[model samples]
Target: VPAVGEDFPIDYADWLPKRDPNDRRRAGILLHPTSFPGPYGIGDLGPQAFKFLDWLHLAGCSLWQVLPLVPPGKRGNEDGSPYSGQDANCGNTLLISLEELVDDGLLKMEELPEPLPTDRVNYSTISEIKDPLITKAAKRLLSSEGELKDQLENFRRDPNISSWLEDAAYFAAIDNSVNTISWYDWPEPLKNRHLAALEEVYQSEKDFIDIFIAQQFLFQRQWKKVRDYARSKGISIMGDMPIYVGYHSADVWANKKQFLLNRKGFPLIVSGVPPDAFSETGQLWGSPLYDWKAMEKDGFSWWVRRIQRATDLFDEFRIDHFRGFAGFWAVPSEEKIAILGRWKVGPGKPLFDAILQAVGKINIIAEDLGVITEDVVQLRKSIEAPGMAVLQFAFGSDAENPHLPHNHEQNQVVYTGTHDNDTIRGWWDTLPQEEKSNVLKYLSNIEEEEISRGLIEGAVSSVARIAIIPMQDVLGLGSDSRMNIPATQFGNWSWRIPSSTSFDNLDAEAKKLRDILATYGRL
Candidate 1:
């Protein structure tokens, strides 16, 4: 099996293994699923996704990344991002393509109302009006007999996936009966299955299970099509996997013993971050921590599965908050902020070994940024997981800062800015005069207005193997287009690009980026 830092031709049967470190001249764009174009008030795996893929292929982008593609558990939930999902294993039905449903004889094409606004996503309106239509269509497919049943049978036979699906299917059934509530909020017996309420749910809500499973099937199907097209275009997607699972997730609920849960099934302790610039309260993320004893008892099967599922979805997978694997901040469930938390030991190297033992070869991108400890860097390097660099972060410092272009190692991935950061233009506008002057001096006397573009050029031209820019930066937007604010609730994950925003120059810009790629010997 190929290990990390290897390169294989695109058509190689083992192409999924690690790519060559020497062939690092790759660049891609970061766009979340909710940003995909559709008439459903938000992006779905529909025609617009393909259109975006074609645009990327033409623009010479070799990678496309997205947020965690899981069901957003509760609206404006404890974590404001999609990564905080109720079921990590279950696909977000909200992201399933309704247009595809129409083509599948699940809904009539005429049933769709007028096309929605192309500029902004109205998620509230979308959930209230559109999702139910897809559910209804799912029921129609569920009730179909021969061809649909045969297709479902074929899906069930895939041993690589069905075990996870069976559990996900059971969880989905219970969700509908309880008005789609998180499992933690469910009654104790249902939570523990002392009365086997989930099994009972499987019997009673069989139709709901089929509908929900079909929804996942459709998402995976469309995603595979999109992924295959991306591969054909020499575009490798960088997908993300949050280190911790949401507290209300099916993984914890279905296997409560595997987490730090009390006899009553409440979390003994929770997860959060220390006070930072983003929030005074310091983001109480509220995800459950694993009971490593139980995990080790089973050889960390759950942890391995999480990585496996993500690897199946993309060429490059980034573990968000990768430092946590070395040592995580553990807070008691009763705490409001992360102020009182203490550093607890995580599975660390043992976890990585477990993944490799199961999957043979893993292509992982470690998000080893933010207060990185020497121990964390060691763990990342030991496994040869490529870390990241953001150009937006490099300019604030003068010399020897790890993020600065000159300080970057060729083994790393570079970015103009990530989804979490403000756009380059926004960062430039907000920089202090001294920093702005430093930027000008560093990049050869460029004005603030041109600083964003220059920063992007710097990133693409840097020695880093993989260069990525957030969609906001690519389009030269400001704070208004930022993807997520770490601590805030109301205004994050809502930024969307108006389709009319000039993508006409995208091909030219990409050629310039590719030219830099060739110069760096990454092409």
Candidate 2:
């Protein structure tokens, strides 16, 4: 079978991937599910999320982009960054909607707490408040005798759910122990997954292990409802997938050979990027790298299943660090900075070929930012996957910068800014005069106060097929509301949009945003 977009005519777009839902001009918002406005301290898949979908529908937006959905890592949990998750495949229990749990007969009116009044997610505080209720719900459902048992048992039996359920449950249960420690530090038998030790742990911690299982069951169940609600509104959820998994994750512990791990199960060589515009020594993201040769033996079957798992959750998604498929910076695990890293050729064409053959066509975009090579561009185009452009990067460089609106292509996704950058207003405030002129020249000398609004309009009207406005940018927020700041650990991923209870301005903004998109023919 021919790959999509192999031979394309500019006028005749009949060859576009049939599986792609957003192959036309569309408007979207980049808001992670955790950032959805709610009273529960953090956002969730409850009432607030459904209201957002209604808002998206009225605003003429078709896509809702979210960051990774798995539970945050050991450190990331403190800050609530989804990219560094405990398990790549596990759904975050924190996102479970408590209101829905009440409907499920697991929670009660009296047990539910009032919403927290804050614009930021206090992850630790929210977890403290929400975790016990979830455990209590899990206990109630698991111990009760009713038709509910069969519903959960059949859920576990489903092939898609069965594959990762036990592993995720075991990982969380073991990780949450009072004597909690890394898996590598466990007894050799348990660390290596010797059958006897595994059985022994289950014998002692069955109740604890089942709590996680019940949580996953609840998380997926709630998410499906939200996704279906999105579908009803003709909106597609865009899930984000990190290219690498953390060393201490369930992914590494369960499949050691798939990673370049030492006998002690630590990553031998980790992931990072080479130095570029952002820093003198590039950022060192110490996630474990893949063992491509071992994966190739099975024609990347693991990856095919991985893709299917994501497909089950989202209509389409973005592959974070898509350039890594062409080539990646390999930094030795002991390195403190990314300066010593070297470029290693990645799996490239064969990997995508394997995925396409198995899944037909996928709606995925490449996060091809920062010093991309020719090979990376070729691979992204080869698979008919759209690459991204950040409008925030436009003004700092010359006219030819790909992020500039004039340089954008029809098969691209344009963003006002991403999670890593400051909000558009904040970005404008910090811009130097010379670079700031580049913006005025490109945008036809718009007034200073309209920088954020002007950028949103320009991005939506661009030739790119998809335009994504981050919620932060849409609200005209400043640096304090920025989702993340690279090279720093704290004070990121905490911003939340205004709650529906008291927020009245969104309705007016919704009309204005829809009008903008309609003006650009995005509708």
Candidate 3:
């Protein structure tokens, strides 16, 4: 497999295993930009991000993994989860750089709002503060005629985004203009996207649509700078893409025929998982299920474009909930719990084959976690994509589990825990005495304070070709620093590493990590 390059060709199928199975191991970190320290209510693609790249480079790390970069829910009720988006193709305007806007002459230094809490993001307060500034910047960029305006014009016509931008912008404008309601509840004309209806909307809502477009332009432009800087520093960026779109998203509204929705556009059946360790009844994710037959009929063009966008944004990526491609659990939309769901066959290989044919052989990681069946394993193996192994799930039993480090294959990505799991220290505090002793015995009885570092060492020295540790674990933080919790909607996704935290600590941290990498011949 060829090594990832700054302008790496997308056609290298040999890199499908993420590297040669025989290659030396590599290490990285899992941190969303939102968790980075910044004065703004949320982290963004700004100077702090550039400094983070330098920090990772100094630490001898090669990869920076992040969650899905798509726009999340618009209404305050959604609580800013990146997994749920108003548009798959649009960026989170909240992540747009306020400082960059100031530099672009659209905003003034004095215009910047006072910083909110540095410890955690207050999405509601942040929105109230940042939204108006974004609007002000968008208006200025639209009204002026110069390089920024020209760039905005070019972005508007970029074929890569043009395919979906019209609907994305229109849907966002309509959603914001009306009381909080799904597009299905909008007036029939706009809800159905009739020609006359759309024409009327464009005529009346031109400025709103244009403003949304400008905000997107700002996001893409700033994000490209950050991505380019990372590549220049010889660090590869990894992005995540969720398998399903939100039922209320613009993508679903624009491509209604592609989902299993009723006449009123409500989902007949919804996507979710059956019973699992996370919940007794299981998680009832209310997103609409895809009509795989309809998708297959169109050569999976939607998926092809989606993958293409991902490839453009990152050196490599993981497909979240990849098991859904083989088969998915579906519950009646009216069901309040996921207990009654049934499994349905998905467009497995055919869909992937279509994507490969259209988007070329880009590197992909299959997130084959949670209730995985043999078929899901076989499906992932068929494409030679690496499945994930989390060490947090390794010590629960004496029976052979794939998550155990001894059972891991070279073609897998290992982690201490993912965003869905608690931080290592957090999980340790909740462990039973027996399990704690078992962990200590397994690692030859390291001290309690060294548990997180011990697990880090174990993970990096494993046979898995890639190891990723969460930033919280790196700091030995507790439950208060967790990024997200599954099945719950609020109070998650708000954790942040404070801007005041010292990087002087990282110098020693970096040396320890580098020495571990060297000891394992991964440096």
The 10-residue segment with the lowest total lDDT in model 2: 497-506
How does each model score on TM-score?
0.90, 0.93, 0.93
Which wins on lDDT, candidate 1 or candidate 3?
3
All predictions: root-mean-square deviation over Cα?
5.7, 4.6, 6.0
Displacement of the residue 227 alpha carbon in candidate 1, Å: 0.6
Top candidate by lDDT: 3
- Stronger candidate by TM-score (1 vs 2): 2
The C-alpha lDDT values of all candidates are 0.77, 0.84, 0.85
Segments of candidate 2 deviating more than 4 angstroms: 1-22, 76-78, 178-181, 277-280, 500-505
TM-score of 2: 0.93
C-alpha RMSD between model 2 and the true structure: 4.6
Tens-digit lDDT string for candidate 1 (181-228): 466677776767765766678789887777777777777777888899
Q: Model 3's lDDT to the true fold? A: 0.85
In Å, residue 332's CA in model 1 sits off its true spot by: 2.1
Candidate 3, superposed: residue stretches over 4 Å from native: 1-24, 74-77, 276-280, 502-505
